[PDB]
Design an enzyme around this catalytic site. Sequence first.
Site: not given
Ligand SMILES: NS(=O)(=O)c1ccc(C(=O)NCc2cccc(F)c2F)cc1
Ligand SMILES: [Zn+2]
Length: 258
Positions: A94, A104
Amino acid sequence: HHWGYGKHNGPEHWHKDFPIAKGERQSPVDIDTHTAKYDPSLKPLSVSYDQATSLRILNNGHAFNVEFDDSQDKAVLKGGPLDGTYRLIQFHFHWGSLDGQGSEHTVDKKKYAAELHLVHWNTKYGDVGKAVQQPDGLAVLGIFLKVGSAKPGLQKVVDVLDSIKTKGKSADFTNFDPRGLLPESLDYWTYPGSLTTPPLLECVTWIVLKEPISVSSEQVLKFRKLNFNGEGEPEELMVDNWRPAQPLKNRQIKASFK
Ligand SMILES: NS(=O)(=O)c1ccc(C(=O)NCc2cccc(F)c2F)cc1
Ligand SMILES: [Zn+2]
Ligand SMILES: [Hg+2]
């Protein structure tokens, strides 16, 4: 339409489609170092990334993910406040449009240039899809990036960004060693939280390292040249893909160091 980081679909709008946004253990949060509880019972982290198998890097709109083969216990995280084995599935960053913003999590209200998230999932759940449905399904290792001297281990990542400029693009990204992105010290703060992007599931045990890594201005600049849009669409630079700090509520940030 879909969520984003712009004025019309940014973080302040997420709650409309994802009510959990106003939840009880949302991330990120501001780490107030003077109120964080030093916990003597926290064990040291155990980061075993020697057998890590990176597979590819892709621009998914939102950010760029480097994916790893998590079919076996190749790259894992144990120890710290964790119970069980957590497999590394992907890492992403990020960052901001300016060096004074991008992270963040904030430390005593201080924002860093960017933040690296190494996402791992609890193996006891069998697959990531099941893990996200559990309060201790994920463990994300957060590392702050500060602008200064170049990080050699990050250069391979920087060199390939050109081929994944737009949304949907991916490139083969094998043999990348994640260990090159670690600070010297593994001291950390920890608290129960959530994914910082929709669906914002509250399934994360956050492990934020105290020591940031340094990256050159030129390295951070390359992140800023990526696009939120897909090819053939109007160019929107991928910058400021971060969510503002959320209320701590009834949570305690523990520290592994005094
Ligand atoms: N910035 S962070 O580290 O907090 C973070 C880490 C992983 C994900 C992720 O895998 N998203 C997709 C996702 C997640 C859950 C369910 C789903 F379907 C999907 F596509 C999102 C944010
Ligand atoms: Zn992240
Ligand atoms: Hg959950």
